[PDB]
């Protein structure tokens, strides 16, 4: 048991290094998409009219 806990902690320790960087990408994407909708939705009106 003491042999396995350390391995699990090491594995979970590494994942926390990869999760944090992926969270930042989410915030950058969630604002980029909003701009994409406006620029995309701000041209359809030209076709409509």
């Amino acid at each position: 048991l003491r042999e396995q806990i350390l391995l699990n902690g090491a594995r979970k320790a590494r994942l926390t290094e990869l999760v944090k960087e992926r969270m930042a990408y989410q915030e950058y994407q969630t604002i980029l998409e909003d701009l994409d909708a406006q620029v995309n939705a701000a041209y359809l009106k030209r076709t409509r009219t």
Binding site: E3, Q4, L6, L7
Partner: protein
């Protein structure tokens, strides 16, 4: 086997002297409920106890007295000397003595 070895690197795949059967001797099975101190006898000696029909605790006492008698006299004793000390049938005393000398805890004079 350890999952991670001594140097701290996790393993890659993480996830004998046989005494002859003395004539007219019927071995008896030794059970944890019957033998109190079974968990101490060595594997090379447990076979002898079954083959000889003797319980562990009596066996240890016989081992002690033979050891005491030998050490007092430089460790050498005569065959009749071992026979009398055991105080049982001749074959039983002969077999246990032959086991001790082979093991090396005593020497035959």
């Amino acid at each position: 086997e350890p999952i991670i070895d001594a140097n701290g690197f996790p393993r890659p795949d993480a996830n004998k002297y046989v005494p002859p059967p003395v004539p007219g001797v019927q071995p008896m099975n030794l059970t944890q409920d019957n033998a109190p101190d079974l968990h101490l006898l060595t594997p090379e000696e447990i076979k002898l106890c079954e083959t000889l029909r003797i319980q562990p605790k009596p066996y240890i006492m016989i081992k002690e007295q033979i050891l005491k008698e030998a050490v007092k006299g430089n460790g050498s004793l005569k065959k009749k000397q071992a026979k009398e000390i055991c105080r049982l049938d001749s074959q039983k005393g002969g077999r246990i003595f032959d086991f001790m000398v082979n093991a090396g805890w005593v020497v035959k004079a």
